[PDB]
Amino acid sequence: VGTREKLRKMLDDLLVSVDHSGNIAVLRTPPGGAQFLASFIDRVGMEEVVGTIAGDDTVFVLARDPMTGQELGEFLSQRR
Template structure:
């Protein structure tokens, strides 16, 4: 992954790692970050975990692990505030979604695109590489070269179930 060595990039990567799999210690997280090119001290990592809203929670296996405070799961992976927000916003502001290859153009009422794009970004949707929002349009870039149609269809389906 090409990422700048900034606090924001590091914290975004921490959130993505915490969503991907259980991480039981700061040492384990520091190793994962180091493997991706981020060098971090224990003190900085501790502050980053607070900033991203990470908590130590007991998993289904009874072990303690870091998890985000319900704010970034992907659309099909369970309940979270971020997922609920995405569903609510799709139902309220999604006007349409059309795909071409790995691109999706999403239409919203004026002023709503940035809110919906932020909700898409926060769920950590694996199929989505990123979003760019204007006033009433969002451009979504998918990881799969032909993944746009599926993401567009999922957004429309979400809006129908919530609308």
């Protein structure tokens, strides 16, 4: 039903919390969820996102300068 609405649903299904410090937004997932969530982020292609790294329950998303991790995390919290 499109990379549009799936975004939301993936976000609502998975995002436990959003935090930030500096040029990084930190996304918390349930255990094992990090790689899954970061895959869609990479795949919708946000160009204020330089890249992402997933661990097990955490994703670091790197804001493209001048954008900041707070601005980045906000841009997300509205997609939910």
